[PDB]
Amino acid sequence: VQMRTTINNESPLLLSPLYGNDNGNGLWWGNTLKGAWEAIPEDVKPYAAIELHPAKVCKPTSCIPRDTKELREWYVKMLEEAQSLNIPVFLVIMSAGERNTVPPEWLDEQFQKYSVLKGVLNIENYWIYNNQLAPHSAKYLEVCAKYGAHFIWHDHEKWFWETIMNDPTFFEASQKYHKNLVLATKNTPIRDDAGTDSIVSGFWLSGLCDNWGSSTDTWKWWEKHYTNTFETGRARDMRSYASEPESMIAMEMMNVYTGGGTVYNFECAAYTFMTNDVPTPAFTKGIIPFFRHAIQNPAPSKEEVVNRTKAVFWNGEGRISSLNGFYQGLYSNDETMPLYNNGRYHILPVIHEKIDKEKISSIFPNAKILTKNSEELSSKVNYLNSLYPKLYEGDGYAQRVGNSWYIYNSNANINKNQQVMLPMYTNNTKSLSLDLTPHTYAVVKENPNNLHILLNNYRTDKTAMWALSGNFDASKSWKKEELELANWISKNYSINPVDNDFRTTTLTLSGHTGHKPQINISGDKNHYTYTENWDENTHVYTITVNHNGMVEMSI
């Protein structure tokens, strides 16, 4: 059977979600299916699909998809509309512990009837686990495999993922139907961010799913009690989910991309996608630019990830869920939030206990296998440092990925700059330094005879939204107050974004071989300025870029 969607490093997948209303045209946030697909740029469409979440159609609880006549009617309504418009869709059929979801036979019928039906999603169970979720998922995965479709499971936490893959039914189904399975993170619950990346990407490296990825959830900002950027002492509300910096959404995608991930999903869609069929700046200037990067520059392949791996942690003699400082001193000081401090070790794979040690040796013949009982963990950092050399200086995040550096400022909600000094691997220049304000990322690619540099620091000022009068408490999710916020977004944030405050990224090329570089530079229109400086004696070129948005250069 031919796959309904081609998903791999050369063909990643962007999911954009719509939500059922038990009223009106059947969709929340003023959106339509036609408008959702209109929002997807033409170059992105071959690598995109629309997620259909029944949301308020579900009864008794919004978003919990208990099988009902109204649920099936809604799925069919949306399938009919998508088929008429040739829009690729995935249905959310499992969430939040629901045991009585649509029958596999019903899903089988829908695959037969609708060529636009590309697969299904199970989303969010870490707070409401039960022993039916893994077996039910296994049965739906089998149906997916019959039709060349994908089963996409978004979930989180070390103990949780350990538990799922210990299920004999799901472990067996994963081994058979890995082609049709995508396992993915969902960092809403502000715990275990580093461990979850390690385990989920570890499943992919272990051959249990052919793709992994993420649901990048701006509700984390609300969970943290954060408000306007850098602000303390204000009560959280729904405006918090519209307050994670736009470029920081892209930095979360970078963690997935550089780890070999290939599937990207997002919440909360009022901020991250569209309201009233008007796409948001977080979508157009945050998610889309990074996803375009991922289309144009394939992520590391499985074999590239295997070959750069110097050590793995195997859960076979005690599990990573029982080592709650593991990532301290290595690359995450704070597993409640997604940003990494250090790129030196990449994402360190965690291999599940159900994979035999002999199999690990087979997959990673050159890697050290660490376990909880490894003597070396008595000096964990020194030992891993003996395997992964130090590649740069400074306090920013930098990761070497083939012939590129992937870089960001790792401060989520503290207004402090970071610097990196990056040795270079070609004689285009000897070293490259960056001074980066918060919510700035960079990618530097070394071609044989030029450097290509991407900068992006896009962050709108959220002050206006936070200044509004009204009740926007999260208790009004799925109610009129939430729609008021969505309406305001469509007329303020999305059409007059407050994005004219520029911040400075300073790029210094030391030992740039020839004479004054002649730069080729472009960027978001009206959103950058720059000054150049060349020292002919020291062969140092400096470009000072003042920007709020994307800037690209070839040197």
Domain ranges of the chain: 1-300+460-498, 301-390, 391-459+499-555
Cβ atoms of 47 and 295 within 8 Å: the answer is yes
Cβ atoms of 9 and 262 within 8 Å: the answer is yes
Distance CA 429, CA 351 (A): 39
Q: Is 514 helix (H, G, I), strand (E, B) or coil?
A: coil
Segments in 167-232 forming alpha helices (H): 168-177, 193-205, 219-223
Distance CA 468, CA 451 (A): 45
Q: For tokens 């791996």, name the residue.
A: 309
DSSP 3-state percent helix, strand, coil across the chain (nearest 5): 30, 25, 45
Domain 301-390: CATH architecture, name and number where available: 2-Layer Sandwich (3.30)
Query: Which amino acid, 520?
Result: N
Fold of 1-300+460-498: TIM Barrel (3.20.20)
For 378, half-sphere exposure in the C-beta direction (CA atoms, 13 angstrom radius) is 4
Query: Which amino acid, 102?
Result: V
| Resolution in units of Å | 1.5
H or E segment at 275?
strand 274-275
The whole-angstrom distance between residue 11's C-alpha and the CA centroid of its chain comes to 16
How many CB atoms are closer than 10 A to CB 432?
27
The partner residues of 258 in beta bridges, in order of sequence, read none
Using omega within 30 degrees of 0 as the cis cutoff, is the peptide bond preceding 60 cis?
Answer: yes
Cβ atoms of 330 and 380 within 8 Å: the answer is yes
Sign of torsion over alpha carbons 283, 284, 288, 289: negative
Sheet bearing 441-446, strands edge to edge: 397-401, 404-408, 441-446, 451-456, 550-554, 520-523
Q: For tokens 């997002």, name the residue.
A: 266
Query: Which amino acid, 364?
Result: F
DSSP 293: H
**Helix 104-113 and helix 69-85, axial crossing angle in degrees, nearest 10:** 20
The partner residues of 443 in beta bridges, in order of sequence, read 406, 454
Q: b vs e for 527-538, b when ≥16 Cβ sit within 10 Å of the residue's Cβ?
A: bbebeeeeeeee
Q: Where are the beta strands (DSSP E) in 21-107?
A: 48-53, 89-95
Distance CA 311, CA 305 (A): 12
Using omega within 30 degrees of 0 as the cis cutoff, is the peptide bond preceding 268 cis?
Answer: yes
- The residues, any chain, with a CB within 8 Å of residue 196's CB and separated by 6 or more, are 156, 157, 158, 161, 185, 187
Distance CA 277, CA 487 (A): 11
Segments in 86-167 forming alpha helices (H): 104-113, 133-146, 158-166
Distance CA 513, CA 35 (A): 50
Segments in 438-493 forming alpha helices (H): 463-466, 480-491
Query: Which amino acid, 414?
Result: I
Distance CA 52, CA 49 (A): 10
H or E segment at 74?
helix 69-85
How many CB atoms are closer than 10 A to CB 437?
18
- Tokens standing for residue 23: 């009223």
Fold of 391-459+499-555: Chondroitinase Ac; Chain A, domain 3 (2.60.220)
- Tokens standing for residue 71: 């649920």
- Tokens standing for residue 334: 């704070």
CA distances from 373 to 285, 292, 311, 552 (A): 46, 43, 15, 47
- Tokens standing for residue 386: 């003996």
Distance CA 500, CA 549 (A): 10
Q: What is the β-pairing status of strands 441-446 and 404-408?
A: antiparallel
Distance CA 463, CA 405 (A): 33
Cβ atoms of 347 and 332 within 8 Å: the answer is no
Cβ atoms of 425 and 401 within 8 Å: the answer is no
Cβ atoms of 280 and 271 within 8 Å: the answer is yes
Distance CA 336, CA 481 (A): 29
The partner residues of 444 in beta bridges, in order of sequence, read 405, 453
Distance CA 337, CA 334 (A): 6
Cβ atoms of 17 and 31 within 8 Å: the answer is no
Q: Is 157 helix (H, G, I), strand (E, B) or coil?
A: coil
Phi, psi of 186 (to 5 degrees): -160, 90
Q: Where are the beta strands (DSSP E) in 46-167?
A: 48-53, 89-95, 117-123, 150-154
Residues in the chain: 555
How many CB atoms are closer than 10 A to CB 126?
19
